[PDB]
């Protein structure tokens, strides 16, 4: 039920990503480079396994998961977390837990653009991705 999310997407706007990274304890030099990086996110499915690739000139990640089933993840900033991804209100909600902390990565389609909202602590970052053909 994840189908409109599938494809290759390019970052076209970012708000408050420095605040989100700083909340997670990312150091200033990594924040600096990240603030100038425009990732490509690729979301594919094979049966009920999703694979989400994030590619850039700086960091690169890949995760595979089944919705609703917890998985181990090592994030771009090297946090080792317990993760689960579900559909909720038509949004793809990715929850990461580690050391009693949590962060959510929520993706929603609005007017054909994929809006990624990242929340940790009080920090709320909104990143807009546009689909590639
Ligand atoms: C894979 C590219 C990551 C770029 C930024 C690296 C340092 C901060 C990492 C924070 C967690 C992951 C944020 C993902 C943001 C996104 O997908 O647009
Ligand atoms: N096992 C890991 C990942 O879990 C971690 O995310 C990543 C850091 O980002 P990058 O690969 O870009 O250094 O290193 C590996 O490839």
Curated annotation (Swiss-Prot):
UniProt entry tagged with the keyword Transmembrane helix: no
Residue numbers carrying Phosphoserine: 23, 83
Listed InterPro entries: Calycin (IPR012674), Fatty_acid-bd (IPR000463), ILBP (IPR031259), Lipocln_cytosolic_FA-bd_dom (IPR000566)
Modification type Phosphotyrosine: residues: 20
A GO-annotated cellular component: sarcoplasm
Record keywords: Acetylation, Cytoplasm, Lipid-binding, Phosphoprotein, Transport
One Gene Ontology MF term: long-chain fatty acid binding
Record-listed N-acetylvaline modification sites: 2
Main location: cytoplasm
Localization per Swiss-Prot or TrEMBL: Cytoplasm
Sites of Phosphothreonine modification: 8, 30
Family: Belongs to the calycin superfamily. Fatty-acid binding protein (FABP) family.
Domain notes: Forms a beta-barrel structure that accommodates the hydrophobic ligand in its interior.
Role according to the record: FABPs are thought to play a role in the intracellular transport of long-chain fatty acids and their acyl-CoA esters.
Full protein name: Fatty acid-binding protein, heart
């Amino acid at each position: 039920m994840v189908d409109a999310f599938l494809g290759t997407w390019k970052l076209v706007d970012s708000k408050n990503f420095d605040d989100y990274m700083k909340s997670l304890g990312v150091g200033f030099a990594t924040r600096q480079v990240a603030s100038m990086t425009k990732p490509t996110t690729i979301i594919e499915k094979n049966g009920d396994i999703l694979t989400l690739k994030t590619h850039s000139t700086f960091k690169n990640t890949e995760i595979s998961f089944k919705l609703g089933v917890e998985f181990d993840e090592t994030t771009a900033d090297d946090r080792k977390v317990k993760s689960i991804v579900t559909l909720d209100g038509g949004k793809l909600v990715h929850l990461q837990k580690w050391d009693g902390q949590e962060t959510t990565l929520v993706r929603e389609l609005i007017d054909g653009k994929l809006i990624l909202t990242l929340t940790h602590g009080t920090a709320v970052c909104t990143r807009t991705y546009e689909k590639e053909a």
